[PDB]
Each structure stands twice: as structure tokens, then as C-alpha cells.
Write a protein that binds this ligand. Structure first.
Ligand code: CA
Ligand code: CL
Ligand code: CL
Lengths: 236, 247, 235, 236
């Protein structure tokens, strides 16, 4: 199956547990069953800082009591390749999307743009995406910029997902990951912690109200769904 | 508060089809009492401002949906640093209104195809922190724009980025009125249209998300990196019992 | 005035410039450089120590050395659009007159909140495409600049470029983006020798050349097929 | 059976009915827009690039109308056919016949026109592939550029804005006027000719401005690119 294996999932050496709240959603909304998050990365390279960033994000999410799933786009058809939504990878990507209650997208910024593999993934998400939350992240080999995360945010908005305000943008990514692929203790890691903390809190909050949040006035008008006793006549 | 726009004919919504309007959108979702508090900002000082008039329609809708509204009047708002330290009654009022709000609506027209200076000036005067206060953080935001031509998203997109910078939960739905001048009558009211229905959807969504987010503003803004920096060590062995069980 | 023009201190002091490689008349051989190319410079902050203003002042010294006449607008009393009925305020009138006077412009804004400031935008907003048969921006050249407290970015210059485009200005390709700008200026407000300074020299050199090249053809370049068609068969 | 083999092909689009401009009002068009402005002999050389390989590509069709207008204004034009140019996710090679030809065309050009559909907020992969293969200091510097876009929905400027900044990165001089066709499918007749509209009039303005500005700057490419910092770096 096209899922990435999270090695040492409980090993969080860059996290200061004296400050990390184990259960961020406690008091906001029920945490059972665990909040479901699908994580997507935008690099095919063996040593992808996008994936490794996504993996650190996953470890943090699991620590916060969330259930995670990291999609492996290795064989997902790329944008210019033979498209067919009957493709096994496309089908599994859709399945994971319907599964998730919230999502994390992480893309490298290649010259002010997100990557083909990131686009391909987004293009193959089911407006079935309505009401799911989203956290955006980017990595770059150069100076910190926000073009990729801003692009991701607007794509998420177009799909009617709720993109949280906090986001991650790692500058000179190569300097932040050791040989083992783990992330070094830094403000950047602290930021991913914050983003995942916020995403758990917000997802737990919005997840039980998906129906109601997507029950729109214009949709009721178009369908002729006259509100339960909104008139002075006996319904219906 | 001196700098508030008077909302005329507040309860008359002729463009809204009330057989489909839910009067209390947050009911069953989250407590809607007291009324959710919404601050609305517009981006032109022109007498016949379509951004102001769209904001006024938004306000009527919010009130219909049971919100309490305030529309800031930026007519004497100085440019940042125009008046020393920005110590100006208009800045103090806008800042106080932001703190009061639980959610906000920002509506800008385009000048030279971009967000107006009037709109920017107001947002610029909202700080992330000031004397232990964070007047925008953990509040919801709905973005809207108007234009004289074909439907545009330049302004709403910029507004969305600003709201993110201000750490606001910006709702996905938004409004962009194309050829705005065709949509408003001599009395400044919007005629029935998909644009109007869109604004209704946007305010309905804002009310729902605001009611949901407001009881947890402090929690959503209680950040790991901030606790670490301040040195606020988390003791679950003593201070966990203080947090009540979620409904 | 109030005054609404900034005085340029030590205008002939260019220690960060190596005159042995500078061409004092960059337009010589391209287009007439007399009378002086007229450049209006605008900055994006009213803060006491404004790096956007300081960078613009370095730009102005360079321009004058390259044979330009310059005006640096001070927007300290500029009202927001429509804050004064019909924008009938001396600051607006002066800014518009300065734009009309110009043959090219320099806009320099700090990048804040990932955008250009409201002070920068207020000045641009007050520039009309056309007012009473006058087009005070169209066909003029533009150079864009930005300053930042952090690493080098281009959001402000990109926004400025797109505004210049709307104003139908010929925006030169070279541009300036000073990163960690606090490190680049001394206590007296002068820019330290660096690649950032050399860039400004290049940008002003390019601006003088294009301004001299474009200026004799402003009318022709702004005489458009669609507008002729709109005006119909005169008379 | 096979006795003959072919490889001697040119990647240029044929312009049908080049002198047929029914949407243009000739009483208001200036046939030599640079006359009296800058020398218009030899003809200004314009390379045009479009952003879709689809049969009824409105991007290509808008570019064809632009080419006709340019030829009317006395320019020589070349429209590159990117049908066999490898796309960004495919194997890349500088020795590829399509790359060499595109680069030859870029060198020949004094100005360029780039027209792309805007898909969701971005330019196309075929447009990208072409721009990627122009550059290799910038050899493209000093050439002028006019940007155009087409969209299936309301008029937007995301594609032209992207093209403009790509042009700027390559130190081309992008003219201020530009074309953005809204609901492009509505603006072309069955034969692929553009209907008279303010959109067609705009393309006329753009090509008029491009001919004028290109004639103006082309004799001075050397001096315009003789830079203080480069002279300093050279030494002496
Ligand atoms: Ca002097
Ligand atoms: Cl620079
Ligand atoms: Cl440009």
C-alpha cells in the first residue's frame, strides 16, 4: 500500500516535553476517536526535506493524540502523464482524503512554485473536500520565502478547506536535517510543533460540525428546501 | 465609540429569501448567546462607496443571523506614523473595537487593481501584541471585495494573507462583487442576485465559525513555542484538573 | 510646500561609488541628456529612521551624479484618498504636479506584513491614470526598490512593479532589494559599500538611460489604436 | 517498404490568412507605428510562444491574431510549435532538437510574446517548458516582451503576472500593456478567428506598443547592458 512508514514515531528529541501539552484539544472538543490527518509531501527525491518535514509533523501529531497517514505519491501519475482516475494510486489518494478530517501539505519551493508531484496530488483530491482542515508547509534550499505556502493556501481555499493561520517555512532545509533524516532542534521545529498543535485543536473543534457548516443558504434556495416552520403556514 | 457607521434600515433585507434563511445558524453548533461580536471594516471613504454599502448589507445579514455588529468609520484615521507614535483617538478606537470583536469582516475595493490604502491603513494599525493584548489573534475573519469590472480576486487574496499574518481564522467562503455599480440602487441597497446570496452564505458561515471558535480563543492561542520562550512549564499533575470537560 | 520635498544632504558625497568605473553621462550616445532627466522618488515610511527613505536618498545622489534633476516627495501630511472631499488637499496637488513634472520615477517601499505599506500605497493611489486630459504617469519610466529587516525577498518590488504596470509606466528590469537593511546603513544614514549599493548604482544607471531614451516619445508611445478608434472620425 | 526517412523539420506554426484582419479598423491603425519614433528597418523580429497543444487552443489562436497584427505593423514573426518539446517532468537534454530550435529562435528575436492559459492561478507546463529553455548573466537580456493570457472564466491576471516576473528574472523588458481574454471560448468563431471586441482592440494596442518599444530599444542593447557593477568586477 502507498503509505510511508514512520520510523521511531515516539522519538521526539527536538521537542521540550516540559512545555508541550500532550492533549491540546482537551477542553475544546472531544478527542475520541482520535483526530484523523492525511499528510502529503511534494518531492520524489530519495532525500526529500519535504517528506522528512512531513514525518516530523506526523510524529508531533501522533504525540498530540492524532491518527496519521502519510501518502506515498511514488507512482501517482504526474500532471502531463496519461491521466485516468481509475488508476490505483489516484483511487487510494481519494480514499485517504475521504478518511482524513484534516490535512497537511508540504511542498518545496522551486522558483516561486510548488512541485509537479504536489500539484498532481492536489489535482486528484475528490466539492467533497468541504469542511476538512488544512495546514500548509514549505521547504527551500535558499532564503525563507512564502510563495509555495501561499499557493497551497489558495488551492486549499478553492477546495473549500479551512486552512489554519499557522504555517511552516523552512529556509536552507539542508542545514536543518541530520544524516538520519531527523530534524535538528531549532525555531523551525518549534514552529512545526505549533502548527500541529493548532491543527489538532482546530480539527477537533470543527470536525463534529461538518454537515451544519456546509448547510448553506444558497444551496437550500436552489434545492427549494424551505426551512422548518419559517413561515406562518402549517408545514408542509 | 465615536467612529461607528450608522446602519440604516437594519431589519429590511428585501434581497434575502426568508423561506431558506436560517435565523440562528450557530444553533445546535455552539452557544449563540450572547450575540457573536463582529467588527466590519471597509476600504473606501467615498460617499457612494460600494465596499461600504456591501459591508452594510453584510451587517444587516449578520444582525438577521443574530450577531451584534460594529462598522468602523476610518474618516479621520491617520496613516501609520503620520501622527507621533500613532497616539490618535481613531487608532485607539479601532484597536478597542478589534479587541471587542470575536470575528471580523474586511471588505476592500481595488485602486489600480490592488487593495486600497484606506483598507491597508486600518489593518496596519492593528498590532499582533500591545501591553499584553493580542487584539486580532484567535478571531475569525471573512474577506470580501468589490470592483468596477469583471470579477476579481486580487483584493480578497491580499486580505486573506493579511488575516493570516494577523493570526486570524479566515473562513473559506468569500465575496467578490463584479461591476458593483450595477448591483446597488440610488438608496445604496443591493438588488437580488447571486452576489447578494453569496454574501448571505459568507455571513452565515462567519456566524457559525465565530460561535464555534470564540469560547476557545485563549486555548487556540496558547502556543508551545511561546510557553517555551516565557518558561511556562506545563504541570499536568496539578493544573490539568482546572480544565473543564468539553460538552 | 510644508516642506513636501526632502532635502538631500551631502548630495555630492558618494564614497561607496568607485568613480573610475562610473559613466557620469550614462545616456550619452543613446539619447539627449540635456535638459536633465527629471526623476520623482517616493518612499514608503514616515518612521523616524526610515531605511526606505535612506535608500531613496542614496538613489537620488546617484541620479544627480548621473545628470538627473530629482524631487523626493515627503508624504508626512498626505491624507488618505477621499479623506478630504475630492482630494482637494495641497499634499495631493503637489504630489500630482511632481508626477506630471517627472519623466521617470523611483518607488521604494519597506516589505511589511509581507506587503507594501499603506504610506506607499496612499501615494500611488493618489496618482490618477488620467485627470482633466492629463496623464501624469503614462509613458514614464519606473525603477522599483525595497528594504527588509530579514533575508532578501521580492514581494514589495513585485507589488510596486504591478502597480507601475497599471499606471502604464515602463518599469525597468533591474531592481533593488536590500536585506537586513539595518546592517547596511551607518548612524548618519549612509549606505556602506556593498553589492546592495552597487546594485542601486546599476539600477539608477539603467533608469537614466531608459528615461532619456523614452522621454522624447512619451506622446507616440501613449497614442493607442483603441483610443483613436474610440475618439472616432474627427471632426 | 520504408525507403525514405525524415528529420529535417522546422518547429514553426503556419499562419493562415495572414493579411486578413476583419476585426481591425484600418482607418485607425497606423501601419508603421515606429515610423518617426525609431528605425523600423530591418523589420523588428518577434518570437511568439503559446501555452496549449490542444486542437482549438485559444492561447494559440490569440497568438495567431497577435502575429497577424505584428505583420501588419511591419514586424517579422515566428510562432514556435512546442509539440515535441519535452515537458518539465520528462527527461531533459540541451541536445534535444526542440530545445536547440527554440533557443535559435530566441536568439533571432528582438522581442517576444508569451501567451498562456491560466489554469487555476498558474501558467501551463508547456508554457513553463518553453520559458525554462530560453536562458542558460542572461543571454535573453535586452529583448522586449509582451505578455498575454486566456481563461475560461472571468478576466484575471495571475498568468500574465507570472510571465512578467519570469521575463523580469531573465532581464527582458516587459511592456506595460497586456492582453487577458475572459471566457476565451466565447471570443473566437468556428474558424478560430477572433470576433471584434475590446479584447481584439487590446491585442492591437499591445502589438502596436511592442513594435514601437522594440524598435526604440533594439539599437541600444549593448549600451543598455553595459553596467557599472560589471565594469567594476572586470577591474581596472
Ligand atoms: Ca551636486
Ligand atoms: Cl539588491
Ligand atoms: Cl514590468
Amino acid at each position: 500500500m502507498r503509505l510511508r512508514h514512520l520510523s521511531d514515531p515516539d522519538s521526539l528529541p527536538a521537542l521540550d516535553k516540559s512545555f508541550a501539552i500532550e492533549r491540546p484539544a482537551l477542553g475544546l472538543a472531544p478527542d475520541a476517536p482520535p483526530v484523523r490527518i492525511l499528510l502529503l509531501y511534494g518531492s520524489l527525491r530519495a532525500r526529500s526535506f519535504s517528506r522528512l518535514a512531513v514525518e516530523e509533523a506526523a510524529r508531533l501529531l501522533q504525540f498530540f493524540g492524532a491518527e496519521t497517514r502519510i501518502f506515498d505519491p511514488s507512482d501517482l501519475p504526474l500532471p502531463d502523464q496519461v491521466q485516468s482516475d481509475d488508476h490505483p494510486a489516484v483511487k487510494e489518494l481519494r480514499a485517504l482524503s475521504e478518511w482524513s478530517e484534516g490535512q497537511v501539505w508540504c511542498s518545496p519551493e522551486r522558483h516561486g512554485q510548488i512541485t509537479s508531484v504536489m500539484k498532481a496530488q492536489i489535482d486528484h483530491l475528490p466539492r467533497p473536500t468541504q469542511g476538512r482542515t488544512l495546514a500548509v508547509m514549505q521547504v527551500s534550499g535558499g532564503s525563507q520565502s512564502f510563495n509555495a505556502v501561499n499557493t497551497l493556501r489558495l488551492l486549499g481555499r478553492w477546495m473549500r478547506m479551512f486552512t489554519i493561520p499557522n504555517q511552516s517555512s523552512i529556509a536552507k532545509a539542508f542545514q536543518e536535517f541530520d544524516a538520519a533524516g531527523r530534524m535538528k532542534p531549532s525555531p523551525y521545529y518549534d514552529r512545526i510543533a505549533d502548527v500541529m498543535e493548532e491543527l489538532v485543536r482546530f480539527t477537533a473543534l470543527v470536525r463534529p460540525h461538518r454537515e451544519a457548516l456546509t448547510d448553506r443558504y444558497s444551496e437550500r434556495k436552489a434545492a427549494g428546501h424551505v426551512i422548518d416552520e419559517a413561515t406562518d403556514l402549517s408545514s408542509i
